[PDB]
């Protein structure tokens, strides 16, 4: 089936970039967070 | 049917890749 | 030829309904 | 044929009335 | 005008089938 | 219509969610005002 | 002209369309500020 | 007619996906609210 | 319904963090009380 | 189905996670409350 | 350039329906 | 214009619904700034 | 150019819609704004 | 390229259109 | 560019907003601060 | 499957260039 | 191929767009942000 | 792949961007908490 092999490449390209996707959130998340608890703990402390 | 069935199936992988990343960023705001 | 349409519509189709598959995706 | 390409269109179309109906509904 | 009543049809079908969701999660939140 | 039938059972589904949020609510503002109030009186009667 | 035959027919599926929305968010939106006053009322008379 | 069939086959796979997406949901929401009231009740008893 | 049970389910997880809630009030109040009154009565009777 | 295998996946990855920010929450708020009970009780002896 | 004019006039109904109804909510909930 | 009559039915809905918000923000504060006071002037003049 | 034509045709429709858009805009902000400073100048003077 | 640069030069001109409403909005609601 | 004086006129608008903007915040912050002091150096004074 | 390439290739460019602006406003509002 | 040469006119329209898009981006943030640090530094020395 | 170099851009951006991040928060905490120990430490030894 033509439509058949057209998904099956799709598959294929979306792979690759949920793993891009994935990179990019972890560092950005880890900057977001990181100020939040920075933020929280100087004024508990204070 | 085979043009509905593998666009809807297109559409259902599209939703299923993304929404991971919306339960990781929920779940860690929270927590912290 | 019809044949060339015919294909273009189908991969055209693929992508564009994962697309909004992903938009869908990032709803909260 | 052109009864191919006729049949094509209405299959996307209904898909892609349903995604666009699905983003709509998650709008808070 | 069939094609049009029964893509009318389809996004319509979307938009209740998510929606009843989008009512779950906020009557949740605001309870809690 | 086609999708008529559809709305009738949204609508069905949303009062009876309506109904189990309205529970919740109760049991969870009952603990907090009970608390603030023991912790407000026990002070004063001290 | 055939796309003002398209428009016109439109133009009824939607209106009853936007009838049922009005229904649904009438019940939601009744219920949400329901429960945000009882919170807000409950806490400032305690 | 073709476009009634359309619509028929479409339903049948919209009612498998509306079943997945309901049993995501209840585990992430389940979750998220246990956090929330962990925090509110801690803060409060203290 | 799928989300019925999702509801009795959180219902119960919140009564049971209730219940540890009343537990840790009641030894925080119950210092905070004893000192107080440790330190009006030795006062008085000296 | 093409999707089925997918959203095992998604139930997977969510389960694991949910795991991940439960032992995140204990740390966070253990600290918090510490640090609350320090302050509170060391100006009361004093 | 009927069909321009009249998938336009389609574009702009729809967005006044809706908008309609954003209005309702956000009223709402400020006024409360 | 097709569009020009639906513009004059939401203008006219936005000015009554502005009348509607007006009402009811007069009635809620009312009587939170009533309470607030009563609270304070009773302490006062005891 | 047909496509030179489509683009031209469309700008004049587009500018039209732009000036209903503001005109709505400025009433339902000014009555969000007006009721914000409301809420906000009520309580300060109380 | 006719096509795309009047399709593409369409899309650029409903971002302007709405952002500047958008800007509106937010400049206000920060102010007040 | 069809698109090059749609957005200089957007940046034209902008310079234009930022300005109304400041003017606004003087204003409403003027008046809280004002009211902040006047109720705190009275109880002082008395 | 040129089309599908070269399709998919333009959806991946205009998610990076615009995510490329979301995490400035992010970043820039929290440090602040 | 024509899909090839279609990608590779698509990317040079849109490189002229995003360097648009960050020239108004620097002015609104810019503003934002500096109304924002205004209030919270006002209040505190305050 | 056509997207690769684009890909590469956003990671490097990125990093640059948490290091700016991380220098305003520095200096607009160092601020706040000196103010607020200023504040109190005044008071005290008055």
Redesign the interface.
Same mark, same amino acid.
């Given at each position: 089936?033509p439509?058949?092999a057209?998904?099956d490449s799709?598959?294929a390209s979306?792979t690759e970039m949920?793993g891009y996707?994935?990179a990019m $959130?972890v560092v950005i $998340?880890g900057a977001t967070?990181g100020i939040?608890?920075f933020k929280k703990f100087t004024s508990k402390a204070s | 049917?085979?043009?509905?069935?593998?666009?809807?199936?297109?559409?259902?992988?599209?939703?299923?890749?993304?929404?991971?990343?919306?339960?990781?960023?929920?779940?860690?705001?929270?927590?912290? | 030829d019809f044949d060339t349409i015919y294909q273009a519509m189908?991969q055209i189709?693929?992508?564009l309904?994962?697309?909004?598959?992903?938009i869908? #995706? #990032?709803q909260?």
């Open positions: 089936d439509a058949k057209a998904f799709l598959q979306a949920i996707a994935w $959130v $998340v967070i939040k608890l | 049917m085979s043009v509905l069935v593998y666009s809807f199936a297109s559409f259902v992988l599209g939703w299923c890749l993304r929404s991971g990343i919306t339960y990781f960023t929920r779940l860690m705001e929270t927590s912290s | 189908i189709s693929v992508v309904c994962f697309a909004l598959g992903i869908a #995706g #990032g909260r």
